[PDB]
Structure 1
């Protein structure tokens, strides 16, 4: 028993926070969350609205609102993301899942 999570990022080029930040050059005015927090949390901008995906797990999120924590949204939706886990740790993810 036990298939293993693949180690390969969904989008290796977006592995750089710096490059993820560039993608937010057109992050909308009506959008309520700061790109720097999004990019720190592994997300990069796709399309022209407020859609993001994680570079590693390719989790896709949109409809961002003031107060939304990207790291938390990441843990809420994509708990097995190896990037989220290396960055925030097992305890953090578990705590977002158990609530």
Structure 2
């Protein structure tokens, strides 16, 4: 099961980005869709399922791509995007 079941709802994850510092650069809508919530500290986000944390987001970064790059064993990522998608990033 998920590491943090309480953030399993995409709407709750989206609400967490109310003070996100990079709205133009990396859309909260995409981050929330990809399983991430904002920790509230700088640009640090975390996946509700694997609990993997990412920071130092750059212009044009794609949340799903970064999810697969750094946490390829996440079961939320696998269920959502499939194995072909993960393998292609690696």
Task: Determine if the TM-score, normalized by the shorter chain, exceeds 0.5.
Answer: yes
Give the shorter-chain TM-score range.
over 0.9
Q: Could you list the runs of 5+ residues in structure 2 that have no partner in the other structure? A: none
Q: CA RMSD in A?
A: 1.4
- The alignment of Structure 1 onto Structure 2 pairs a total of residues equal to 89
Q: Is the aligned partner of 1:29 residue 2:22?
A: yes
**CA contact 1:41–1:70 (8 Å) conserved in 2:** yes
Kept in 1: contact 2:19–2:40 (CA 8 A): no
User: Residue 65 and residue 31 in structure 1: after superposition, are their counterparts in 2 closer, same or farther (change >3 A)?
Assistant: farther
Structure-2 change in CA distance of 1:29 and 1:87 (3 Å): closer
State the Cα distance separating 1:29 from its structure 2 match: 4.8
Moved over 3 A (4+): none
- Superposed displacement of residue 47, structure 1: 2.8
Greater relative contact order (Cα 8 A, min sep 6): structure 1 or 2? 2
Q: Give unpaired runs (5+ residues) of structure 1.
A: 1-7
